[PDB]
Write a protein that binds this ligand. Structure first.
Ligand SMILES: Nc1ncnc2c1ncn2[C@@H]1O[C@H](COP(=O)(O)OP(=O)(O)OP(=O)(O)O)[C@@H](O)[C@H]1O
Lengths: 858, 431
């Protein structure tokens, strides 16, 4: 039986090498647009993909289950898959026989008539003012503007409009377009030929290197005012090289650039005030464009078509490209289509092919390791929004995230992937998480349709709706399933090799299908369903992600200890009370979500690698527990509850916390009273970046001593409720380097009967660098707070003002960037005649400010 | 057949008779009525000193009676439950109850007994425990009313956390144990609000504490309300069958308090405020659709009512409130619950009129047999009762709004109760 072991080891190593080679080939193939592949390579690539799936499964089985029967099965599968690989190779070799270029579809749009653009005037004039901006604009240094957004939004159209409008007030200008994979010689020759068609008429035939072309451009632009537009920049090196030709200084010249990428725009412009962000049209403008495109002369929509029109316009989203293409589709110049045909289109040609080809540029440009992470978005329903933590943990579980470096955490890699997807304008971010990051994301609908078609053409994902998207006609091997309409019934007797199941139905029939037959699973996601108990979760042996959130589960089988591979375990909103003991024996576990009302077993110190722990109970617990807490060393998020926890042992807890070197966020929730932990001389962890005490009824005393800017060099969030605030407490907050967000409560003002005291700031300038929001709830003063001009980035101020102090000046010209102020007045001490006086006074003080912020007196 | 509603406008003439009748008969003395809201039913002339020493005698008799039962329950017990321990508890109970002592000693011993009763074999065992706690805090209330204890110390006693976590537990559990079967047989248990618990003479003392906090610290009063509603949901007075969004969790009260101190948070909400307001709008929508089930609408009403009564203005959204016009609906349902509770009180009082009902119909130790209000029909009673029920229904029929979307929750309970009452009043009036 020894030789069995050795043979199996050898076979597995061979499979690993073969997998590397296959992935290299597939990544190489998947770059070519579909119009340049031939059928042979496409078919062969599909078959290679299937073989890759099978070999991955075999390798994983060996890694998990390692006896006689297992080794025998593994050897059988090994032999079979090797045979199939050889056969496919011969097949390809048998029928191999060796035996122009199209133009960019976006080129025709430059010759569209100008009387067909609907709502440009406003944006056009705003951009023109952003360019000139004054009377002596012809004497200021060179300036660069940039425009960003997603495809089809109308960037080059706006640039063309402004250029044609104001080109008269310059000496020379050009309008050049850079593509995805550019040749720098061609770009420089284009600039030269655009500057003077007569002198450099034959410049496209010259053969010099880039240095001499750059020298020519520099010599021609000497002592001239120029306006130059550069279009469709796709990465950084291109701009880094082209920037050399505009190195000299020339008073009065202007540059414009347009792009889809945000970092490129940050690299072009100097200040973040020189960035224009395109935004979609409003509803009325979109509707007029629609009507003008289809009902062109009548401009009268019949009534029966109103509501389908409105739903279609909502699906378009205000993007002119989609509006135009769908309007041409429904126009059918011969005849307007019928209402039922409109419905059919809504539920579900040259212009359509062009739009698809245009939008796919951003997909064909991604790095190879980001393409699966994008297709994975086709699992979720249409219009809802997606939590990012869910996405990141599922990506890690599926195996899309990996690296070879020794000192890297997969969580931050996944976060980087998400931020990169947002950077390329393919995802709309929404909200702010409770750990300082994005909360959720949204996807445009046409993009969603493109993604669904792409992922369906490769058996990446199979969706189950009843009206559309039924079971594939001829497919025996399905890997990832997504149940959205519970009306259907499922066979699930041929789906031996599943990998991931997800149910989106509130329906009872959703829990009907049997799961214990998918002997190889990695992702089980039943969030929201009404399943009641799962005893079959053991015997799965392959899981990585177990998501049970918002389900009616009362208790877990005491066999989860068998799942030696289990990254995530999500239990929130369930009815569980006490976790089974065997949970201690899950050595690989990186994330544990739980409610504070659940009892944890004793030996929690064994769970190293824990990177996220949510809502510890910390009640009815002895000391060895709080000492074990000090062993989880690589832990980046923590949340406590202090509910029944006895505040006599806080010192051990603070030592255990100070033991965690890597850490970003921290919460402490306390019902009432004085917080008896985190005493002075604590030495917080160095990398801390976010701190919060959301209690609002449990105070600190004067202030923690460890808030000095040396101990907490990094901090971008703070939320504290003190007992009594001093005047030289805000000073210590001025000392903090970053402190983007801040919120302080004065406990004595509300709960006790103390009165609002005016704090005074002194002895310094630039007190609050990078403070965009401040909420001094309980204590307020506008002028004396900010002397000389400090915090030149604030945008929202919250302060309190007694009506007694009607007779201090409310001048808002210390602070340039003000945009919003929320005030509340205390009127019992002073009479109403002083009250309305102070009201009108601060109103005028807000009106004088040039930015003209908004007020609220409350 | 449905008996038609009485249609009378309230007269000071019969007001006099009904008023002295309520002021004379025992159970209606310590309770107040909705009819106090009427224009002219004035002239109460009541003094609380006599009612107070009456309560003293009642408490003495009830503690003595339960002690009597405790000895014999220790005599023959099915698995010894250390009943002499509860006996020592009632021993120190009577001790503290009889003597005058210094305020500090009373504080110490009250806290000791209360904190050690804090920490399942028999059911009436637990009933005895609950009655011990209730009698202890009743002693507290009487002692405060006896001017032997200041206000400062009373607050320092009640405002500390553990006492707050006990008041609600007792206030809900005792009411359940005492009135649940009566409410079920009467068929009104589906309309039982924690808001109107302290309107029975059995729970007047609680009310005192309540206004005391409204005296001094409104924050703690609102906290006590938010606590008692959660405790009521927990012990199954109102089953929702899945989960409560915002009542059992500690981090929800923090958000509510934060909003209550600086309201502008509602305009610029955080995430927890966001999903709070989303759940509120969802429950509102559920409450304002007529062919949803009754239990869901009642549960939604109870939750929204508690939120609005303790944290004012959070449930309000200006525009849609007028198109829905649900505010007056809320007031109508509240009025219905109050009047239904009073009708149940009257129905329970009727049992005192039975020739053979020595057994109390209110609950364990509700009334000591030393008083045991008798069967003696008096001159006024036979007229005053029917007049009072007719006046109740007449006063109610006016303020209720009439629309079938809202008719489902306020009209038919009143109609069914009027039917049951008009059917059973005579048969009891004969014999
Ligand atoms: N205000 C408008 N009214 C009517 N049509 C418009 C308007 N703005 C843009 N369009 C149409 O949208 C189509 C695409 O716009 P355009 O190509 O300028 O966007 P883009 O930002 O250049 O896209 P990409 O980023 O792919 O280059 C053009 O055919 C243009 O006719």
């Amino acid at each position: 039986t020894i030789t069995l072991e050795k043979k199996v080891r050898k076979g597995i190593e061979s499979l690993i090498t073969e997998l590397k080679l296959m992935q290299a080939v597939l990544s190489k193939v998947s770059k070519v647009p579909a119009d340049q592949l031939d059928e042979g390579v496409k078919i062969w690539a599909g078959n290679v993909k299937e073989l890759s799936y099978q070999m991955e499964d075999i390798v994983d089985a060996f890694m998990v289950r390692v006896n006689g029967k297992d080794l025998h099965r593994i050897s059988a599968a090994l032999e079979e898959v090797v045979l199939q690989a050889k056969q496919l190779a011969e097949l390809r070799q048998r029928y191999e026989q060796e035996m122009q270029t199209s133009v960019d579809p976006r080129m025709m749009a430059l010759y569209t008539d100008v009387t067909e653009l609907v709502g440009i005037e406003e944006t056009r004039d705003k951009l023109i003012n952003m360019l000139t901006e004054g009377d002596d604009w012809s004497k200021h240094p060179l300036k660069t503007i940039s425009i960003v957004g997603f495809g089809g939004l109308g960037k080059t159209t706006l640039a063309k409009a402004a250029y044609d409008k104001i080109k008269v007030q310059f000496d020379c200008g050009a309008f050049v377009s850079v593509s995805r994979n550019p040749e720098m010689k061609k770009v420089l020759k284009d600039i030269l030929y655009g500057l003077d068609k007569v002198k450099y008429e034959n410049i496209h035939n010259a053969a010099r290197d880039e240095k001499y072309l750059i020298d020519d451009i520099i010599e021609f632009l000497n002592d001239k005012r120029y306006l130059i537009v550069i279009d469709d920049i796709w990465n950084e090196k291109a701009w880094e090289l082209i920037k050399c030709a505009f190195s000299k200084k020339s008073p009065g010249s202007r540059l414009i650039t347009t792009t889809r990428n945000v970092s490129v725009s940050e690299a072009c412009c100097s200040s973040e005030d020189d960035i224009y962000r395109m935004e979609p049209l409003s509803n009325d403008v979109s509707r007029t464009l629609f009507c003008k495109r289809i009902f062109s002369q009548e401009e009268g929509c019949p009534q029966e078509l109103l509501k389908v029109s409105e739903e279609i316009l909502k699906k378009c989203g205000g993007v002119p490209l989609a509006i135009i293409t769908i309007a041409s589709l429904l126009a059918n110049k011969g005849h307007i289509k019928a209402k039922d045909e409109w419905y059919a289109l809504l539920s579900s040609n040259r212009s359509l092919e062009q739009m698809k080809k245009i939008l796919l540029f951003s997909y064909y440009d991604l790095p190879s390791y980001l393409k699966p992470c994008l297709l994975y978005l086709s699992i979720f329903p249409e219009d809802r929004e997606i939590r990012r933590a869910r996405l990141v943990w599922r990506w890690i579980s599926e195996g899309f995230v990996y690296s070879e470096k020794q000192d890297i955490s997969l969580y931050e890699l996944g976060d980087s992937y998400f931020n990169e997807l947002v950077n390329r304008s393919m995802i709309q971010p929404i909200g702010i998480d409770d750990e300082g990051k994005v909360k959720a994301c949204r996807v445009h609908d046409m993009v969603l349709d493109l993604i669904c078609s792409l992922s369906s053409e490769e058996n990446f994902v199979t969706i189950l709706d009843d009206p559309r998207r039924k079971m594939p006609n001829s497919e025996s091997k399905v890997r990832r399933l997504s149940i959205q309409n519970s009306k259907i019934d499922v066979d699930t007797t041929r789906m031996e090799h599943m990998r991931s199941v997800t149910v989106f139905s509130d329906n009872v029939v959703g829990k009907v299908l049997d799961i214990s037959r998918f002997k190889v699973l990695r992702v089980l996601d039943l969030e929201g369903c009404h399943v009641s108990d799962v005893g079959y979760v053991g015997n799965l042996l392959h899981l990585r992600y177990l998501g049970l959130k918002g389900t009616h589960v009362k208790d877990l089988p005491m066999e989860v200890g068998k799942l030696q591979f289990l990254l995530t375990l999500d239990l929130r909103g369930t009815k569980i009370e006490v976790l089974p003991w065997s949970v201690v024996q899950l050595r690989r576990l990186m994330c544990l979500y739980v409610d504070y009302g659940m009892k944890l077993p004793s030996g929690i110190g064994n769970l190293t690698f824990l990177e996220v722990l949510d809502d510890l109970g910390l009640s009815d617990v002895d000391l060895d527990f709080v000492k074990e807490l000090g062993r989880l060393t690589k832990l980046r998020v923590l949340r406590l509850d202090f509910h029944g926890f006895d505040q006599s042992m806080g010192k051990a807890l603070e030592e255990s916390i100070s033991n965690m070197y890597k850490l970003d966020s921290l919460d402490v929730f306390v019902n009432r009273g004085l917080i008896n932990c985190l005493s002075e001389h604590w030495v917080p962890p160095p990398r801390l970046c976010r701190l919060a005490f959301p209690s609002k009824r449990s105070w600190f005393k004067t202030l923690p001593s460890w808030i000095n800017p040396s101990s907490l060099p990094l901090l971008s969030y703070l939320d504290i409720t003190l007992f009594e605030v001093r005047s030289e407490d805000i000073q210590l907050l001025g000392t903090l380097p970053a402190l983007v967000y801040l919120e302080i409560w004065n406990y004595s003002v509300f709960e006790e009967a103390h009165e609002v005291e005016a704090p005074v700031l002194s002895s310094g300038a630039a007190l609050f660098p990078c403070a965009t929001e401040c909420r001094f709830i309980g204590i307020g003063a506008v002028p004396s707070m900010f002397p000389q001009g400090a915090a030149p980035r604030l945008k929202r101020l919250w302060f309190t003002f007694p009506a007694k102090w009607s007779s201090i000046g409310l001048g808002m010209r210390h602070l340039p960037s003000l945009q919003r102020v929320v005030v509340d007045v205390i009127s019992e001490g002073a009479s109403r005649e002083e009250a309305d006086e102070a009201e009108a006074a601060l109103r005028a003080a807000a009106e004088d400010h040039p930015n003209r912020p908004i007020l609220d007196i409350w | 057949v449905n008996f038609p509603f009485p249609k009378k406008m309230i007269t000071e003439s019969n007001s006099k008779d009904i008023r002295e009748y309520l002021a004379s008969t025992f159970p209606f003395e310590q309770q107040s009525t909705i009819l106090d809201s009427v224009k002219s039913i004035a002239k109460v002339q009541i003094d609380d000193r006599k009612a107070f020493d009456l309560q003293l005698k009642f408490r003495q008799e009830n503690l003595a009676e339960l002690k009597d039962q405790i000895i014999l329950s220790l005599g023959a017990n099915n698995g010894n439950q250390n009943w002499q321990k509860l006996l020592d508890y009632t021993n120190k109970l009577d001790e503290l109850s009889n003597t005058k002592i210094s305020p500090e000693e009373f504080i110490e011993e009250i806290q000791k007994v209360l904190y050690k009763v804090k920490l399942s074999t028999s059911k009436l065992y637990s009933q005895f425990n609950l009655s011990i706690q209730d009698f202890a805090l009743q002693i507290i209330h009487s002692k405060y009313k006896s001017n032997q204890i200041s206000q400062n110390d009373l607050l320092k006693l009640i405002t500390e956390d553990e006492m707050l976590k006990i008041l609600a537990k007792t206030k809900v559990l005792t009411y359940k144990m005492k009135y649940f079967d009566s409410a079920s047989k009467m068929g009104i248990n589906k309309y039982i609000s924690t808001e109107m618990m302290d309107l029975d003479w059995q729970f007047s003392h609680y009310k005192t504490f309540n206004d005391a906090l409204k005296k001094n610290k409104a924050s703690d009063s609102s906290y006590l309300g938010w606590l008692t509603h959660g405790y009521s949901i927990k012990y199954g007075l109102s089953p929702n069958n899945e989960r409560s969004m915002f009542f059992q969790d500690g981090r929800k009260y923090a958000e509510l308090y934060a909003f209550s101190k600086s309201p502008h948070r509602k305009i610029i909400p955080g995430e927890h405020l966001k999903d709070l307001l989303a759940k509120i709008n969802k429950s509102k929508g559920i409450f304002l659709d007529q062919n949803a089930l009754l239990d869901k609408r009642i549960y939604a009403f109870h939750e929204l009512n508690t939120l609005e009564t303790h944290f004012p203005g959070i449930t309000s959204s200006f525009t849609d409130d007028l198109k829905s016009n649900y505010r007056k609906k809320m007031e109508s349902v509240s009025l219905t619950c109050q009047v239904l509770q009073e009708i149940g009180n009257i129905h329970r009082f009727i049992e005192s009129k039975v020739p053979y009902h020595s057994s109390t119909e209110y609950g364990l130790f509700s009334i000591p047999k030393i008083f045991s209000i008798p069967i003696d029909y008096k001159h006024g009673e036979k007229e005053n009762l029917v007049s009072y029920v007719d006046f109740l229904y007449s006063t109610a029929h006016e303020r209720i709004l009439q629309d079938n979307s809202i008719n489902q929750l306020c009209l038919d309970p009143l109609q069914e109760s009027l039917n049951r009452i008009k059917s059973n009043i005579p048969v009891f009036f004969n014999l």
